[PDB]
Ligand binder design. Sequence first.
Ligand code: HEM
Length: 152
Amino acid sequence: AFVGLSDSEEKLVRDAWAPIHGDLQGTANTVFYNYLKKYPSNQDKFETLKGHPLDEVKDTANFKLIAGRIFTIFDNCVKNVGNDKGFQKVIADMSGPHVARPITHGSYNDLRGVIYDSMHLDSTHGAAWNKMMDNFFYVFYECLDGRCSQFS
Ligand code: HEM
């Protein structure tokens, strides 16, 4: 389900994300690399990266564009903490390309985990962060399941 955050939790989320907000592309590049390295089956899902060694594509514009667009969405979600309709709309608008493709919940959840590891949060910030990410994926998965109209 979608669960609203408390004032303190909203603050904790913004603070948790702050370091990444301040270097969005640089964090994105490292996280997306660690993701494709630890979970290599996913590289094939990106036609622009498919068929090349990870180390051959990691420094390319294609790779950074993909990494950057993922983190821009999460950045825009954090900006919309406290605005449920705005938060849900950000996700709804990015869900379409994913409805269409052979990508498992495992793949999304593995990405979520690499993101979490890279943030090195204490358990207070982590709990607030996970509430937001649980909300993100509730909306995202509702949209993948063809119930996005409520959010669009
Ligand atoms: C859960 C976090 C992710 C976010 C925030 C996200 C965000 C984005 C955005 C913003 C787009 C482009 C939408 C547009 O063109 O208007 C996109 C496209 C796409 N995404 Fe994601 N994505 C996520 C996860 C994934 C995962 C885990 C994979 C695969 C393993 C994936 C595969 C794709 C592919 C294949 C496309 C179409 C573009 C392409 O051909 O490269 N995404 N995503």
